[PDB]
Amino acid sequence: CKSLISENEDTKDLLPSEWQDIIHQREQELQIKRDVLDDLYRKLQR
Amino acid sequence: QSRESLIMLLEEQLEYKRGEIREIEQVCKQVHDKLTSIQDTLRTGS
Amino acid sequence: RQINKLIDSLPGVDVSAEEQLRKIDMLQKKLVEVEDEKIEAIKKKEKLLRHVDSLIEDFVDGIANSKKST
């Protein structure tokens, strides 16, 4: 057990607000991308 | 024959400038078409 | 026979030079209008060009301040 824990870094990392922060950064970048794409769509149609 | 030489030079520069002009609107129109296609592509990815 | 087929193929061989005079004059006229039209064409092409440049700059600033917002 301890050996198997030892060789794998990923499991030991697996072995809580950071996920929420990543979700917030993803959604803010998504919404800014949507806003800039809307601006480009509005401007280019002329 | 001087008038004939004037005529021939006339049509050669006239057709040259028409060719330049027509390639200008062709290239700007193709750029605009590419921009519109990109706008549609980014709108589909929204 | 090449002499005959070249002598009769001279535009203006059977056309009086004075209607060449009017056609040449109106040619320079319509030329004046065609470079005029090219002037408006190029100025509006440059106008849309720097509209595109302005939106490029705005989008680049948005990218920059978004990716440095975190």
PDB file of all heavy atoms in Angstrom, chain A residues 16-43:
ATOM      1  N   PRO A  16     -10.546  23.008  -0.618  1.00  0.00           N
ATOM      2  CA  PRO A  16     -11.444  22.551  -1.684  1.00  0.00           C
ATOM      3  C   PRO A  16     -11.953  23.697  -2.557  1.00  0.00           C
ATOM      4  O   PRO A  16     -12.662  23.457  -3.532  1.00  0.00           O
ATOM      5  CB  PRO A  16     -12.593  21.899  -0.915  1.00  0.00           C
ATOM      6  CG  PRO A  16     -11.956  21.406   0.336  1.00  0.00           C
ATOM      7  CD  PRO A  16     -10.893  22.414   0.686  1.00  0.00           C
ATOM      8  N   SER A  17     -11.588  24.930  -2.202  1.00  0.00           N
ATOM      9  CA  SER A  17     -12.034  26.102  -2.947  1.00  0.00           C
ATOM     10  C   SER A  17     -11.268  26.310  -4.245  1.00  0.00           C
ATOM     11  O   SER A  17     -11.674  27.158  -5.049  1.00  0.00           O
ATOM     12  CB  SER A  17     -11.915  27.352  -2.072  1.00  0.00           C
ATOM     13  OG  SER A  17     -10.558  27.645  -1.788  1.00  0.00           O
ATOM     14  N   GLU A  18     -10.178  25.573  -4.466  1.00  0.00           N
ATOM     15  CA  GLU A  18      -9.401  25.744  -5.690  1.00  0.00           C
ATOM     16  C   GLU A  18     -10.228  25.393  -6.921  1.00  0.00           C
ATOM     17  O   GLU A  18     -10.137  26.069  -7.955  1.00  0.00           O
ATOM     18  CB  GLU A  18      -8.135  24.889  -5.630  1.00  0.00           C
ATOM     19  CG  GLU A  18      -7.223  25.218  -4.462  1.00  0.00           C
ATOM     20  CD  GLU A  18      -6.368  24.040  -4.040  1.00  0.00           C
ATOM     21  OE1 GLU A  18      -6.934  23.030  -3.566  1.00  0.00           O
ATOM     22  OE2 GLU A  18      -5.130  24.121  -4.179  1.00  0.00           O
ATOM     23  N   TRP A  19     -11.039  24.338  -6.829  1.00  0.00           N
ATOM     24  CA  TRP A  19     -11.919  23.985  -7.938  1.00  0.00           C
ATOM     25  C   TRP A  19     -12.914  25.103  -8.227  1.00  0.00           C
ATOM     26  O   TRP A  19     -13.173  25.426  -9.390  1.00  0.00           O
ATOM     27  CB  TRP A  19     -12.644  22.673  -7.632  1.00  0.00           C
ATOM     28  CG  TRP A  19     -11.734  21.484  -7.606  1.00  0.00           C
ATOM     29  CD1 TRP A  19     -11.399  20.689  -8.662  1.00  0.00           C
ATOM     30  CD2 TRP A  19     -11.034  20.960  -6.469  1.00  0.00           C
ATOM     31  NE1 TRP A  19     -10.538  19.696  -8.254  1.00  0.00           N
ATOM     32  CE2 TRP A  19     -10.297  19.843  -6.913  1.00  0.00           C
ATOM     33  CE3 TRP A  19     -10.959  21.324  -5.121  1.00  0.00           C
ATOM     34  CZ2 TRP A  19      -9.498  19.087  -6.056  1.00  0.00           C
ATOM     35  CZ3 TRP A  19     -10.166  20.572  -4.273  1.00  0.00           C
ATOM     36  CH2 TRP A  19      -9.446  19.466  -4.744  1.00  0.00           C
ATOM     37  N   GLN A  20     -13.476  25.710  -7.177  1.00  0.00           N
ATOM     38  CA  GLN A  20     -14.389  26.833  -7.379  1.00  0.00           C
ATOM     39  C   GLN A  20     -13.679  28.012  -8.030  1.00  0.00           C
ATOM     40  O   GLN A  20     -14.247  28.680  -8.901  1.00  0.00           O
ATOM     41  CB  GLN A  20     -15.019  27.248  -6.050  1.00  0.00           C
ATOM     42  CG  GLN A  20     -16.242  26.432  -5.666  1.00  0.00           C
ATOM     43  CD  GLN A  20     -15.889  25.162  -4.922  1.00  0.00           C
ATOM     44  OE1 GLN A  20     -14.804  25.041  -4.357  1.00  0.00           O
ATOM     45  NE2 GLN A  20     -16.807  24.202  -4.924  1.00  0.00           N
ATOM     46  N   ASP A  21     -12.442  28.293  -7.616  1.00  0.00           N
ATOM     47  CA  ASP A  21     -11.690  29.384  -8.233  1.00  0.00           C
ATOM     48  C   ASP A  21     -11.434  29.109  -9.711  1.00  0.00           C
ATOM     49  O   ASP A  21     -11.522  30.016 -10.547  1.00  0.00           O
ATOM     50  CB  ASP A  21     -10.373  29.604  -7.491  1.00  0.00           C
ATOM     51  CG  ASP A  21     -10.571  29.801  -6.002  1.00  0.00           C
ATOM     52  OD1 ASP A  21     -11.673  30.225  -5.598  1.00  0.00           O
ATOM     53  OD2 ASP A  21      -9.625  29.528  -5.235  1.00  0.00           O
ATOM     54  N   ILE A  22     -11.103  27.860 -10.046  1.00  0.00           N
ATOM     55  CA  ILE A  22     -10.883  27.503 -11.447  1.00  0.00           C
ATOM     56  C   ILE A  22     -12.177  27.645 -12.243  1.00  0.00           C
ATOM     57  O   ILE A  22     -12.173  28.111 -13.386  1.00  0.00           O
ATOM     58  CB  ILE A  22     -10.298  26.083 -11.554  1.00  0.00           C
ATOM     59  CG1 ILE A  22      -8.929  26.022 -10.874  1.00  0.00           C
ATOM     60  CG2 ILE A  22     -10.162  25.669 -13.009  1.00  0.00           C
ATOM     61  CD1 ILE A  22      -8.428  24.615 -10.638  1.00  0.00           C
ATOM     62  N   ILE A  23     -13.307  27.256 -11.645  1.00  0.00           N
ATOM     63  CA  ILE A  23     -14.593  27.426 -12.316  1.00  0.00           C
ATOM     64  C   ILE A  23     -14.881  28.904 -12.554  1.00  0.00           C
ATOM     65  O   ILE A  23     -15.363  29.291 -13.625  1.00  0.00           O
ATOM     66  CB  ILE A  23     -15.719  26.748 -11.509  1.00  0.00           C
ATOM     67  CG1 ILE A  23     -15.487  25.240 -11.428  1.00  0.00           C
ATOM     68  CG2 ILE A  23     -17.076  27.046 -12.126  1.00  0.00           C
ATOM     69  CD1 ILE A  23     -16.393  24.535 -10.444  1.00  0.00           C
ATOM     70  N   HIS A  24     -14.599  29.749 -11.559  1.00  0.00           N
ATOM     71  CA  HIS A  24     -14.836  31.182 -11.720  1.00  0.00           C
ATOM     72  C   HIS A  24     -13.956  31.777 -12.815  1.00  0.00           C
ATOM     73  O   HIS A  24     -14.427  32.583 -13.624  1.00  0.00           O
ATOM     74  CB  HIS A  24     -14.614  31.917 -10.398  1.00  0.00           C
ATOM     75  CG  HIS A  24     -15.606  31.562  -9.333  1.00  0.00           C
ATOM     76  ND1 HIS A  24     -15.419  30.511  -8.460  1.00  0.00           N
ATOM     77  CD2 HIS A  24     -16.791  32.122  -9.001  1.00  0.00           C
ATOM     78  CE1 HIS A  24     -16.447  30.440  -7.634  1.00  0.00           C
ATOM     79  NE2 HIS A  24     -17.296  31.405  -7.942  1.00  0.00           N
ATOM     80  N   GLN A  25     -12.676  31.397 -12.855  1.00  0.00           N
ATOM     81  CA  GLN A  25     -11.813  31.926 -13.906  1.00  0.00           C
ATOM     82  C   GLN A  25     -12.257  31.436 -15.282  1.00  0.00           C
ATOM     83  O   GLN A  25     -12.253  32.202 -16.255  1.00  0.00           O
ATOM     84  CB  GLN A  25     -10.346  31.574 -13.631  1.00  0.00           C
ATOM     85  CG  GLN A  25      -9.943  30.134 -13.890  1.00  0.00           C
ATOM     86  CD  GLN A  25      -8.522  29.840 -13.461  1.00  0.00           C
ATOM     87  OE1 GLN A  25      -7.791  30.735 -13.035  1.00  0.00           O
ATOM     88  NE2 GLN A  25      -8.118  28.580 -13.568  1.00  0.00           N
ATOM     89  N   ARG A  26     -12.685  30.172 -15.374  1.00  0.00           N
ATOM     90  CA  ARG A  26     -13.181  29.651 -16.643  1.00  0.00           C
ATOM     91  C   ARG A  26     -14.428  30.397 -17.100  1.00  0.00           C
ATOM     92  O   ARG A  26     -14.543  30.766 -18.273  1.00  0.00           O
ATOM     93  CB  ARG A  26     -13.470  28.155 -16.517  1.00  0.00           C
ATOM     94  CG  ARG A  26     -13.970  27.511 -17.798  1.00  0.00           C
ATOM     95  CD  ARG A  26     -12.828  27.221 -18.756  1.00  0.00           C
ATOM     96  NE  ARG A  26     -13.309  26.814 -20.071  1.00  0.00           N
ATOM     97  CZ  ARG A  26     -13.379  27.615 -21.125  1.00  0.00           C
ATOM     98  NH1 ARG A  26     -12.995  28.879 -21.057  1.00  0.00           N
ATOM     99  NH2 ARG A  26     -13.840  27.135 -22.276  1.00  0.00           N
ATOM    100  N   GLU A  27     -15.368  30.646 -16.186  1.00  0.00           N
ATOM    101  CA  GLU A  27     -16.596  31.319 -16.594  1.00  0.00           C
ATOM    102  C   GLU A  27     -16.349  32.784 -16.930  1.00  0.00           C
ATOM    103  O   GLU A  27     -16.981  33.314 -17.851  1.00  0.00           O
ATOM    104  CB  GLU A  27     -17.678  31.176 -15.519  1.00  0.00           C
ATOM    105  CG  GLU A  27     -17.354  31.778 -14.164  1.00  0.00           C
ATOM    106  CD  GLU A  27     -17.702  33.253 -14.073  1.00  0.00           C
ATOM    107  OE1 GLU A  27     -18.517  33.727 -14.894  1.00  0.00           O
ATOM    108  OE2 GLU A  27     -17.157  33.939 -13.183  1.00  0.00           O
ATOM    109  N   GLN A  28     -15.433  33.455 -16.224  1.00  0.00           N
ATOM    110  CA  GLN A  28     -15.161  34.850 -16.565  1.00  0.00           C
ATOM    111  C   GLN A  28     -14.452  34.960 -17.910  1.00  0.00           C
ATOM    112  O   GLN A  28     -14.760  35.857 -18.706  1.00  0.00           O
ATOM    113  CB  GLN A  28     -14.365  35.541 -15.451  1.00  0.00           C
ATOM    114  CG  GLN A  28     -12.973  35.001 -15.173  1.00  0.00           C
ATOM    115  CD  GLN A  28     -11.914  35.586 -16.089  1.00  0.00           C
ATOM    116  OE1 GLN A  28     -12.031  36.723 -16.547  1.00  0.00           O
ATOM    117  NE2 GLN A  28     -10.875  34.807 -16.363  1.00  0.00           N
ATOM    118  N   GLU A  29     -13.516  34.049 -18.202  1.00  0.00           N
ATOM    119  CA  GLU A  29     -12.889  34.085 -19.519  1.00  0.00           C
ATOM    120  C   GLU A  29     -13.894  33.729 -20.610  1.00  0.00           C
ATOM    121  O   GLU A  29     -13.878  34.324 -21.694  1.00  0.00           O
ATOM    122  CB  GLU A  29     -11.661  33.170 -19.560  1.00  0.00           C
ATOM    123  CG  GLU A  29     -11.943  31.684 -19.599  1.00  0.00           C
ATOM    124  CD  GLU A  29     -10.681  30.852 -19.499  1.00  0.00           C
ATOM    125  OE1 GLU A  29      -9.593  31.440 -19.313  1.00  0.00           O
ATOM    126  OE2 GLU A  29     -10.773  29.611 -19.606  1.00  0.00           O
ATOM    127  N   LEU A  30     -14.807  32.793 -20.329  1.00  0.00           N
ATOM    128  CA  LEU A  30     -15.845  32.467 -21.299  1.00  0.00           C
ATOM    129  C   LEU A  30     -16.741  33.665 -21.580  1.00  0.00           C
ATOM    130  O   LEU A  30     -17.053  33.958 -22.741  1.00  0.00           O
ATOM    131  CB  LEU A  30     -16.675  31.283 -20.806  1.00  0.00           C
ATOM    132  CG  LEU A  30     -16.133  29.889 -21.115  1.00  0.00           C
ATOM    133  CD1 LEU A  30     -16.911  28.827 -20.354  1.00  0.00           C
ATOM    134  CD2 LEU A  30     -16.179  29.619 -22.613  1.00  0.00           C
ATOM    135  N   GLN A  31     -17.162  34.379 -20.532  1.00  0.00           N
ATOM    136  CA  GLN A  31     -18.068  35.503 -20.747  1.00  0.00           C
ATOM    137  C   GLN A  31     -17.364  36.674 -21.422  1.00  0.00           C
ATOM    138  O   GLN A  31     -17.980  37.366 -22.241  1.00  0.00           O
ATOM    139  CB  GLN A  31     -18.720  35.933 -19.426  1.00  0.00           C
ATOM    140  CG  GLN A  31     -17.782  36.457 -18.350  1.00  0.00           C
ATOM    141  CD  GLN A  31     -17.449  37.928 -18.516  1.00  0.00           C
ATOM    142  OE1 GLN A  31     -18.251  38.703 -19.030  1.00  0.00           O
ATOM    143  NE2 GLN A  31     -16.257  38.315 -18.076  1.00  0.00           N
ATOM    144  N   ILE A  32     -16.085  36.911 -21.119  1.00  0.00           N
ATOM    145  CA  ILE A  32     -15.380  37.981 -21.820  1.00  0.00           C
ATOM    146  C   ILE A  32     -15.172  37.606 -23.285  1.00  0.00           C
ATOM    147  O   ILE A  32     -15.261  38.463 -24.174  1.00  0.00           O
ATOM    148  CB  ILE A  32     -14.056  38.336 -21.110  1.00  0.00           C
ATOM    149  CG1 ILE A  32     -13.499  39.650 -21.665  1.00  0.00           C
ATOM    150  CG2 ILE A  32     -13.021  37.244 -21.258  1.00  0.00           C
ATOM    151  CD1 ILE A  32     -14.360  40.854 -21.363  1.00  0.00           C
ATOM    152  N   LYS A  33     -14.920  36.321 -23.566  1.00  0.00           N
ATOM    153  CA  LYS A  33     -14.841  35.878 -24.955  1.00  0.00           C
ATOM    154  C   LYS A  33     -16.171  36.080 -25.669  1.00  0.00           C
ATOM    155  O   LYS A  33     -16.205  36.534 -26.817  1.00  0.00           O
ATOM    156  CB  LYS A  33     -14.422  34.409 -25.017  1.00  0.00           C
ATOM    157  CG  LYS A  33     -12.953  34.158 -24.722  1.00  0.00           C
ATOM    158  CD  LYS A  33     -12.726  32.709 -24.321  1.00  0.00           C
ATOM    159  CE  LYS A  33     -11.348  32.510 -23.714  1.00  0.00           C
ATOM    160  NZ  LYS A  33     -11.141  31.109 -23.262  1.00  0.00           N
ATOM    161  N   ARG A  34     -17.281  35.750 -25.002  1.00  0.00           N
ATOM    162  CA  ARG A  34     -18.590  35.952 -25.613  1.00  0.00           C
ATOM    163  C   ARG A  34     -18.843  37.428 -25.885  1.00  0.00           C
ATOM    164  O   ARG A  34     -19.368  37.790 -26.943  1.00  0.00           O
ATOM    165  CB  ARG A  34     -19.691  35.379 -24.719  1.00  0.00           C
ATOM    166  CG  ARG A  34     -19.631  33.872 -24.476  1.00  0.00           C
ATOM    167  CD  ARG A  34     -20.086  33.050 -25.677  1.00  0.00           C
ATOM    168  NE  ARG A  34     -19.098  33.019 -26.749  1.00  0.00           N
ATOM    169  CZ  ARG A  34     -18.008  32.265 -26.741  1.00  0.00           C
ATOM    170  NH1 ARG A  34     -17.733  31.459 -25.729  1.00  0.00           N
ATOM    171  NH2 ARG A  34     -17.175  32.319 -27.775  1.00  0.00           N
ATOM    172  N   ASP A  35     -18.470  38.296 -24.943  1.00  0.00           N
ATOM    173  CA  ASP A  35     -18.693  39.728 -25.120  1.00  0.00           C
ATOM    174  C   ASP A  35     -17.877  40.276 -26.285  1.00  0.00           C
ATOM    175  O   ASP A  35     -18.391  41.039 -27.116  1.00  0.00           O
ATOM    176  CB  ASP A  35     -18.353  40.473 -23.828  1.00  0.00           C
ATOM    177  CG  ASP A  35     -19.330  40.177 -22.709  1.00  0.00           C
ATOM    178  OD1 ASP A  35     -20.508  39.890 -23.010  1.00  0.00           O
ATOM    179  OD2 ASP A  35     -18.921  40.230 -21.530  1.00  0.00           O
ATOM    180  N   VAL A  36     -16.599  39.898 -26.368  1.00  0.00           N
ATOM    181  CA  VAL A  36     -15.765  40.414 -27.449  1.00  0.00           C
ATOM    182  C   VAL A  36     -16.220  39.853 -28.794  1.00  0.00           C
ATOM    183  O   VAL A  36     -16.174  40.547 -29.816  1.00  0.00           O
ATOM    184  CB  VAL A  36     -14.273  40.138 -27.179  1.00  0.00           C
ATOM    185  CG1 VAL A  36     -13.827  40.849 -25.911  1.00  0.00           C
ATOM    186  CG2 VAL A  36     -14.001  38.654 -27.083  1.00  0.00           C
ATOM    187  N   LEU A  37     -16.681  38.598 -28.818  1.00  0.00           N
ATOM    188  CA  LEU A  37     -17.191  38.039 -30.068  1.00  0.00           C
ATOM    189  C   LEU A  37     -18.487  38.720 -30.489  1.00  0.00           C
ATOM    190  O   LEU A  37     -18.718  38.935 -31.683  1.00  0.00           O
ATOM    191  CB  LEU A  37     -17.390  36.531 -29.926  1.00  0.00           C
ATOM    192  CG  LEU A  37     -16.112  35.687 -29.913  1.00  0.00           C
ATOM    193  CD1 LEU A  37     -16.411  34.251 -30.309  1.00  0.00           C
ATOM    194  CD2 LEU A  37     -15.044  36.287 -30.819  1.00  0.00           C
ATOM    195  N   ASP A  38     -19.344  39.074 -29.524  1.00  0.00           N
ATOM    196  CA  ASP A  38     -20.539  39.844 -29.844  1.00  0.00           C
ATOM    197  C   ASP A  38     -20.169  41.208 -30.413  1.00  0.00           C
ATOM    198  O   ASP A  38     -20.791  41.678 -31.377  1.00  0.00           O
ATOM    199  CB  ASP A  38     -21.408  40.010 -28.597  1.00  0.00           C
ATOM    200  CG  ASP A  38     -22.037  38.709 -28.147  1.00  0.00           C
ATOM    201  OD1 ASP A  38     -22.288  37.840 -29.008  1.00  0.00           O
ATOM    202  OD2 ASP A  38     -22.282  38.551 -26.933  1.00  0.00           O
ATOM    203  N   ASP A  39     -19.168  41.864 -29.823  1.00  0.00           N
ATOM    204  CA  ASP A  39     -18.721  43.152 -30.341  1.00  0.00           C
ATOM    205  C   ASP A  39     -18.196  43.014 -31.767  1.00  0.00           C
ATOM    206  O   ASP A  39     -18.501  43.842 -32.632  1.00  0.00           O
ATOM    207  CB  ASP A  39     -17.647  43.736 -29.418  1.00  0.00           C
ATOM    208  CG  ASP A  39     -17.280  45.171 -29.767  1.00  0.00           C
ATOM    209  OD1 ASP A  39     -17.825  45.722 -30.745  1.00  0.00           O
ATOM    210  OD2 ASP A  39     -16.435  45.751 -29.054  1.00  0.00           O
ATOM    211  N   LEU A  40     -17.407  41.968 -32.027  1.00  0.00           N
ATOM    212  CA  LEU A  40     -16.891  41.744 -33.375  1.00  0.00           C
ATOM    213  C   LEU A  40     -18.020  41.477 -34.365  1.00  0.00           C
ATOM    214  O   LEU A  40     -17.999  41.981 -35.493  1.00  0.00           O
ATOM    215  CB  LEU A  40     -15.896  40.585 -33.373  1.00  0.00           C
ATOM    216  CG  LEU A  40     -14.601  40.798 -32.587  1.00  0.00           C
ATOM    217  CD1 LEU A  40     -13.724  39.556 -32.640  1.00  0.00           C
ATOM    218  CD2 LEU A  40     -13.850  42.015 -33.105  1.00  0.00           C
ATOM    219  N   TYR A  41     -19.007  40.676 -33.960  1.00  0.00           N
ATOM    220  CA  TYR A  41     -20.155  40.405 -34.822  1.00  0.00           C
ATOM    221  C   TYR A  41     -20.920  41.681 -35.142  1.00  0.00           C
ATOM    222  O   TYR A  41     -21.332  41.900 -36.287  1.00  0.00           O
ATOM    223  CB  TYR A  41     -21.074  39.382 -34.156  1.00  0.00           C
ATOM    224  CG  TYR A  41     -22.281  38.998 -34.981  1.00  0.00           C
ATOM    225  CD1 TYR A  41     -22.162  38.144 -36.069  1.00  0.00           C
ATOM    226  CD2 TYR A  41     -23.542  39.485 -34.670  1.00  0.00           C
ATOM    227  CE1 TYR A  41     -23.262  37.789 -36.826  1.00  0.00           C
ATOM    228  CE2 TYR A  41     -24.649  39.137 -35.419  1.00  0.00           C
ATOM    229  CZ  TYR A  41     -24.504  38.287 -36.496  1.00  0.00           C
ATOM    230  OH  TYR A  41     -25.602  37.937 -37.245  1.00  0.00           O
ATOM    231  N   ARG A  42     -21.125  42.538 -34.137  1.00  0.00           N
ATOM    232  CA  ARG A  42     -21.839  43.787 -34.367  1.00  0.00           C
ATOM    233  C   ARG A  42     -21.051  44.723 -35.277  1.00  0.00           C
ATOM    234  O   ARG A  42     -21.629  45.383 -36.147  1.00  0.00           O
ATOM    235  CB  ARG A  42     -22.146  44.467 -33.033  1.00  0.00           C
ATOM    236  CG  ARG A  42     -23.205  43.755 -32.206  1.00  0.00           C
ATOM    237  CD  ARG A  42     -23.351  44.378 -30.829  1.00  0.00           C
ATOM    238  NE  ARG A  42     -22.240  44.033 -29.947  1.00  0.00           N
ATOM    239  CZ  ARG A  42     -21.976  44.648 -28.804  1.00  0.00           C
ATOM    240  NH1 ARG A  42     -22.718  45.651 -28.367  1.00  0.00           N
ATOM    241  NH2 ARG A  42     -20.938  44.245 -28.075  1.00  0.00           N
ATOM    242  N   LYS A  43     -19.729  44.791 -35.093  1.00  0.00           N
ATOM    243  CA  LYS A  43     -18.926  45.738 -35.860  1.00  0.00           C
ATOM    244  C   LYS A  43     -18.741  45.286 -37.304  1.00  0.00           C
ATOM    245  O   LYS A  43     -18.806  46.103 -38.228  1.00  0.00           O
ATOM    246  CB  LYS A  43     -17.569  45.940 -35.186  1.00  0.00           C
ATOM    247  CG  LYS A  43     -17.529  47.100 -34.205  1.00  0.00           C
ATOM    248  CD  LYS A  43     -16.146  47.253 -33.590  1.00  0.00           C
ATOM    249  CE  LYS A  43     -16.067  48.485 -32.703  1.00  0.00           C
ATOM    250  NZ  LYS A  43     -14.868  48.457 -31.823  1.00  0.00           N
TER     251      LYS A  43
END
